[PDB]
Every structure is written in C-alpha cells, then in structure tokens.
Structure 1
Amino acid sequence: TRKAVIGYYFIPTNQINNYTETDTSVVPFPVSNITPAKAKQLTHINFSFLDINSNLECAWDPATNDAKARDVVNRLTALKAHNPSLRIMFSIGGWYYSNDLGVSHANYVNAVKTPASRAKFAQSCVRIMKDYGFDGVDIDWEYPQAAEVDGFIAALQEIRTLLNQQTITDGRQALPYQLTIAGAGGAFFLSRYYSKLAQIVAPLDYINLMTYDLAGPWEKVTNHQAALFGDAAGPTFYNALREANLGWSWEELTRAFPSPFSLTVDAAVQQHLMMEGVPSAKIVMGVPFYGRAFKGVSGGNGGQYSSHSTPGEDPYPSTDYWLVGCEECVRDKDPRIASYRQLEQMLQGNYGYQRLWNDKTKTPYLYHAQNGLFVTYDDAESFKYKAKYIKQQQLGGVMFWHLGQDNRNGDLLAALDRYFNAADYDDSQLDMGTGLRYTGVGPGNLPIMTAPAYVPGTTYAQGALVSYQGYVWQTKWGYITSAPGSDSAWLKVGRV
C-alpha cells in the first residue's frame, strides 16, 4: 500500500482575486510551481480554506471572485494529468474560521445540530465538490467540543453516504471520493472528542493528525513544535486525556495516560492507537513545512527550554520584525513564523544563526546567539525518522502544511516521497535514538497474552491471570469470586 502524501495548498482570498503565475510579489506560490515531478510525489492536495457560512452550508469566502477561484481549482485538477492517483481535496475550516474564538465558529456548532441541518450541510459539501471538480472533502474544525461530537459524527456519516453514492454514480471505483479530517495532535484539544475517536474515524479514509504546533508563543517555555520523541530535559505537560469522558476506572486511566508527559508526535500517534476501533492505516502524521521563532531566549542550551518575550496575540501586534534575515516575515508582517524556504536562505546568508540538532527529539533547531532567538522547525533529516516511524507503526502516510513553504526545488516533498518509495533508499539501520517513548496502554493496543480460562466457582488470589471473553484479566486484590467484567476487581491486561 502506497503511503499517503497529503500536501495543503493554501491561497488567501486576495491572492485568488488577483491570481497570476508570473509575479511572486502578488502570488508567491502559484499552481505552476507544482511541477509534474512534484505532482507525482503527492497523493493528495488539500485546497484550503473554504468555510461554513451563516446559512450552515459549505461555502467559499463571501469576498471570493468565483471565476478566479474556479480557474485556480482547474489548474490544480489539471495536475492529475501527471499523476492518476492524485486527488485534489478541498478543506473546510482551519484555525482562523473554526477555533472557539474564530469568526465562523457558531456556524460549525449549528450546522451539525439537527438531522435537517446535517443533511443540508452534507449535501452542500458534495455539491461544492462536484461543482468545482474536487476529489473529496476535508473538514478542519479546530475543534468540536464534547457536546458537539455526536452531531459532528452524524454529519461525517452523512457525507460518507453521499460520497459513496456519488462514487458509484460517477463510475469512480478506481479513485473513490474521499473524506478526511484534520485531527488534534496534542492531548489538550484531543480530549474534547477523544472518547469518541472510533465513531469519528469510521466514516473517514484518513484522520490527518496535526502533530505540530506542540510549541508556540502561547507557551512560556520554548520547545520543539514537532518533537518525534521526548527529551527529559524539556518541559512536560498535564495529560488531559485522563479527564476525557471515557468511563474508565482509575487503573485504566492511569496506565493509559501517564502524567505529566512529553508532548510529542509519538505521543499523539500512540494515544490514537490506544483506542479500540482506530486502525493504524487511517492515521496520517502531519509535519510542518514551517518553523516557529521565539525572541528573548537565554543561553546555555541553544535556546531550548528557555523563557522568552515573544508576543502571543493574533495578529502580530507590532511592526517589530525581529527575525533577522526573514524577508517573508516582513511581507507577511509576523516574525514568529518562517517557511523552510526562508529558513534555508537564512542559514545561507550569514545572519548569525547556528543549525543545531536534538538527537532525542530527532528535530533540528536554529539558535541566534547575538540576538537571543530560537526557531523550531523540521527538515529532510527529521523527516527520515518520522518516515521510518510511519512505516514501523503502519500508519497511512504523511500530511504537511503547506506546499508553498517548501523550497524552490521541493526538497522537503521530494524527501518524503524518497523515504517511502525510492528503491535506492534504505532506512533499515536508521537509529531512532533513545528519546522518550509514550508508554501508555489502552484497550486498543493491549499486548497479546495467554492465561488459563476463567473457571466459575473459583476463588482467585491477588494478581491471578485468567482468559475470558477474548481477553486476559488480572485481579486487583485477593479473594475474588466474581467473573471478569462483572466486577470492579478484574483489570483487562491483554488480548487473545
């Protein structure tokens, strides 16, 4: 099974309305920059972002020039001439539209409320897909809360039904229409819907975990934003999942959700695999094509794990563009984010940066000794370890934000495709290091065990192991005369 390679294509409305493929000053990353070689290295392009309007329907930004928008999408779907497996998805949501404090948040809550609203919203998704020529629907609601999850589920189920019927109607058995979501990659947002992961993922082809932004100006201690494994010297976090409305016992919560823990990519993946009904092949690991920069950091450890003075507000509440050498930061008016393309040029232009490597997290980072700056980012080296992880854990593939942040040669995308598909690349001896692994155990990743069959009428001592109804159970205290599952005394510890 070929690994998915899902690249976001993001274009703001102003750039759509003024679209041109011959002037990077207006449109920095036109569709023409996606060469045939790059199209062949992708399996999915997530066009972004559409929204949910006050009519509770999928819709473009109301300021969008529809004729210019159709032309942009047509240029993307023309790329399928170079890659018969390529799908041009469209994404609904993103942080700006759909976060709790976002401009359109209430429309997401209201669209999934009722059977009538869900049917109307689901129909509009398929309509938009067919009217503009997209190959599937991606929903990036960041993020539905506990009371909204069941409606969110039924809406996804409704879209799945309509997409499957549309696949048959259009003869698309060879390339069926698909449904994906961007899912939270950290435990705090994940706890909103974690208990219902199985019913969320059931109608999806993939859940694309946003396993980045695990550090940012909203945290007082600098850190890697997409550490693969944990560094004991770095900060640790409250494991919010132990508070999810799971109904598990104290022992089950404790063994599944050690706290505090290292907020890493491996943690997010393992937390998903701990849940019953979440298959590894549907889990896609997100990676960032951008870095996050911090100022006012101290010395002694390359700027890692230090206090900082980076503004947290949105948008950037100043004109102080303090990321030395970041020309894109001036154009975008924000020194806290830098594309890999810009970071590469900052490393090549003598601005005082050093590129350092953390062999526990398996991620690079920049340090500016003279102005106290720290940048966490990913590159082709960190992608070696993440690609091997994807293969070892039998995940569905990789996702990234976004195509316009790769360098001009497309080195990041080419690296991902190479690590998955190149016949002359061999990572069998790649050293995954001694960084901290997430060691939680849950119902979905219980180890295989053997035990004598449970015998009704037997009195079991503390620590006894029995097999019953497909699982191996252990007594939590002594003098146990009840059957596993009928009591508080038995802990499910294994399967088969």
Structure 2
Amino acid sequence: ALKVGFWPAYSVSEFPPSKINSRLFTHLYYAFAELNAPTFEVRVPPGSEKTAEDFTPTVRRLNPSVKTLISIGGGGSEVRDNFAKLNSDASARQRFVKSSIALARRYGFHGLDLDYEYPEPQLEMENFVKLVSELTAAIREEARTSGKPRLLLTEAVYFHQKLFPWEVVTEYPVQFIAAGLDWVNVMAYDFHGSWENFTGAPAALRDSKFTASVGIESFLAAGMPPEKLVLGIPLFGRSWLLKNNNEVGIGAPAVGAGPVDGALSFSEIQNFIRGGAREVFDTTTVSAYAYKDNVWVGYDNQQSVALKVQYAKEKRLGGYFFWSVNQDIDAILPKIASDTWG
C-alpha cells in the first residue's frame, strides 16, 4: 500500500520538510533535481544542497519507516527540452545515468523519479526508452557493487496510456515500464481549468473522456500490472472567474483564471470557504467546488479523496500520491486517504 507525497523545494520558507506529517506516508519525494544541460551532471539547484541533504533525516524523525525518492525534471517546457536533447545523445545519457545514481546516494535517498512531460512524439518515446533501460541496468549494477538494496525507480505518467487519447502519436510501453520501474505516478488531474471558458471538475474520477478512471482503465487494458499504478490526487484546485455571479455550478460560463493564476492550494481553498465561499460536492464527477462572488474553484475535498482512495483499492492499484504536500498544511486530505486505505 503505497502512500506517496511530493514536497517541492520552492516551498521551503513557508513549508519546510519538518512540517510534513510523514506518519501519513510510505514514500516522500523531493521535487526537483535539475538535468543541468549540457553536461547532464544531475544536481539539486546550487544553493539548495543543505535542504536536499537534510530532507530524508528530517522526514524520517516522525516516521522512521518512511522512504524517500528524489525526482528529476518537472513539468514545463525547459525540462521537456532538456530531456529531448539528453535522450538523443548516448554520451549524455551515460553522464545522466551515472550522476543521477550518485545524487540519490549522496543525499541519502532510497530512489529516483523521472518527471518528463512528455515523451512524445514517437522519436522522443524511443529515446526515452533508451535512457530508462540504461538507468534500470545501472541501478542494478550499483546494487551489486555497493551491496545495498537497489534504488527505487519511478516516473510520472500522463493520466492516459496514450499520448494523446484524441490524437495518438505514441503511448507508454507498459511491459517495458513494469519490468524497469517499481511503479508509475499517474497524474490524474488538470483535466479542466482556466484554458476553458466553462467551469469543470479538474480531477474528475468519472463522468467525458478526461477522467481518472478512464485513464487508469487505459493503463490496465494495455497490460500494466495494477500494483504498478499509483493514483495521483491534487492538493490544489483549478480556479476561474465567473461570467455571471448567479451561474455558479459545473459548466458555468467563465472569463479567465481565478486566483492565483488559475490554481489555489487546498489550504487556501479552506480559507476561501471560511471567508464565505459555498462548498458543493459533485457526485457526478466525484469532486468538489466552491464559489463566492465571481470566483469559482474545483478541487478534491475530504469526501472525494476518500472515494478516490477507495476506488484505487477497488481497482487493485499500488496506492495513491499527492501533489503537493505543502498545499495542505494541516494534512487534512493525506489523513483521510491514509485512514481510507487502512
């Protein structure tokens, strides 16, 4: 039963690792180490070496059984560009593989994660396959030479097995992934947001083609062992500005991004509700939304998280993950999730 949380280094001043309730997790990720083109000597951003080193001893103090991984990359164009450059260059791949393994050992992490959004089109998937195959082999070799248990290896994946479901250019090779990786973190969110002129459920479990269940179904149908899938749950919501204050449900017309630039942490959503916003549970999508005046936000709440976690158990999945733990400062949703699986 994998109970996974991502801690982003950007949040250190407001949410240091000491604030994570590690009792509610089995694995905690440090996000992110950088690719460091053109040498591809993978590293944490210079200046954050102390934070990276202290992360694992700190989180283990509250739950010694908890393990940690360091995630390399992240969302966004710069990371994607760097992976694409890296994966086409055999010498660069070698430097990346060696330095990433060294990095995990240097800071006392138990594993590595790759966050590459996304290995498409076909050429990019083919070259990513080369990188990951080489990384798997080197991880096994390092275990042999050091005598230590092999580093864990995971990666972030799109919600769906096909890239992309409306126009397939490539797809995740599930047998390859199951053999080389301990699990994948399924990013079952960002289905809807301010890029649309209507409100919607950003992480709908079901409904539409853009749902967590449809995505999970696609990986399983391709042949992914269910235990290799870890269901992502966001600790943030997507927000809109409403066109009309009297149209406040799902599918209401919108005029752009709400605060803050279209995303609001769960903790800020709790503040929003305490400040007069009305919370609504949407049973159709298994999600929540809240609104006040011209601001509308869709997110996961106590009820929808319990339902999603039970869904993951019903579907025989490896577990669940939260992005990102700094966004639920009181750990309300990680608590519900942990209690639900137990």
Q: What TM-score comes out, normalization by structure 1 length?
A: 0.64
Which is higher, the Rg of structure 1 or of structure 2? 1
Aligned pair in 2 of structure 1 residues 83, 168: CA closer, same or farther (>3 Å)?
Answer: farther
Residue equivalent to 1:163: 139
AA aligned opposite 2:286 = K
Residue equivalent to 1:137: 112
Residue 140 of structure 1, CA deviation: 0.6
Q: Could you list the per-position Cα deviations for residues 350-395 of structure 1 after superposition, in whole angstroms to 9, with x for gaps in the alignment?
A: 3xx1111111111111122x32x22100012101111111111100
Residue equivalent to 2:213: 266
AA aligned opposite 2:187 = M
Among residues 4, 8, 12, which one is paired with 1:6 in the alignment? 4
AA aligned opposite 1:83 = N
Query: Is the Cα contact below 8 Å between 1:297 and 1:374 reproduced in 2?
Result: no
Residue equivalent to 2:333: 412
AA aligned opposite 1:286 = G
Residue equivalent to 2:92: 117
After TM superposition, list the pairs within 5 Å mapping 1:383-422 onto structure 2.
383-408=305-330, 410-421=331-342
Among residues 192, 202, 223, which one is paired with 1:225 in the alignment? 202
Query: Is the Cα contact below 8 Å between 2:42 and 2:96 reproduced in 1?
Result: no
Root-mean-square deviation (CA), in Å?
2.2
After TM superposition, list the pairs within 5 Å mapping 1:319-334 onto structure 2.
323=259, 334=260
Residue equivalent to 1:458: none
In the aligned structure 2, how far is the partner of 1:307 from the partner of 1:301?
7
Query: Is the Cα contact below 8 Å between 1:153 and 1:200 reproduced in 2?
Result: no
Q: Could you list the per-position Cα deviations for residues 300-321 of structure 1 after superposition, in whole angstroms to 9, with x for gaps in the alignment?
A: 763311331115xxxxxxxxxx
Question: Is 1:303–2:257 an aligned residue pair?
Answer: no
Residue 87 of structure 1, CA deviation: 1.8
Residue equivalent to 2:32: 49
Residue 49 of structure 1, CA deviation: 1.3
Residue equivalent to 2:154: 180
Residue 10 of structure 1, CA deviation: 0.3
Query: Is the Cα contact below 8 Å between 1:77 and 1:88 reproduced in 2?
Result: no
SS of 2:6's partner is strand
SS of 2:269's partner is helix
In the aligned structure 2, how far is the partner of 1:201 from the partner of 1:149?
16
Among residues 32, 38, 54, which one is paired with 2:18 in the alignment? 32
More helix by share: 2
Residue equivalent to 2:239: 293
The size of the alignment, in residue pairs, is: 338
In the aligned structure 2, how far is the partner of 1:56 from the partner of 1:144?
21
Residue 58 of structure 1, CA deviation: 4.7
Aligned pair in 2 of structure 1 residues 11, 387: CA closer, same or farther (>3 Å)?
Answer: same
What 5-or-longer segments of structure 1 have no aligned partner?
Answer: 20-26, 97-101, 231-235, 237-261, 312-321, 324-333, 422-496
Q: Could you list the per-position Cα deviations for residues 413-438 of structure 1 after superposition, in whole angstroms to 9, with x for gaps in the alignment?
A: 111111112xxxxxxxxxxxxxxxxx
SS of 2:296's partner is strand
Residue 280 of structure 1, CA deviation: 0.6
Residue 85 of structure 1, CA deviation: 3.5
AA aligned opposite 1:133 = G
AA aligned opposite 1:380 = Q
More strand by share: 2
Query: Is the Cα contact below 8 Å between 2:230 and 2:319 reproduced in 1?
Result: yes
What 5-or-longer segments of structure 2 have no aligned partner?
Answer: none
Q: Could you list the per-position Cα deviations for residues 420-479 of structure 1 after superposition, in whole angstroms to 9, with x for gaps in the alignment?
A: 12xxxxxxxxxxxxxxxxxxxxxxxxxxxxxxxxxxxxxxxxxxxxxxxxxxxxxxxxxx
Q: What TM-score comes out, normalization by structure 2 length?
A: 0.91
Residue equivalent to 1:375: 297
Relative CO higher for 1 or 2, CA cutoff 8 Å, sep ≥ 6?
Answer: 2
In the aligned structure 1, how far is the partner of 2:193 from the partner of 2:308?
21
Deviation >6 Å, runs of 4+ = none
Query: Is the Cα contact below 8 Å between 1:157 and 1:203 reproduced in 2?
Result: yes
% identical aligned pairs: 25
Residue 165 of structure 1, CA deviation: 2.8
Query: Is the Cα contact below 8 Å between 1:221 and 1:305 reproduced in 2?
Result: yes
After TM superposition, list the pairs within 5 Å mapping 1:440-479 onto structure 2.
none
Q: Could you list the per-position Cα deviations for residues 205-231 of structure 1 after superposition, in whole angstroms to 9, with x for gaps in the alignment?
A: 11101001111122233210111110x
Aligned pair in 2 of structure 1 residues 69, 411: CA closer, same or farther (>3 Å)?
Answer: same
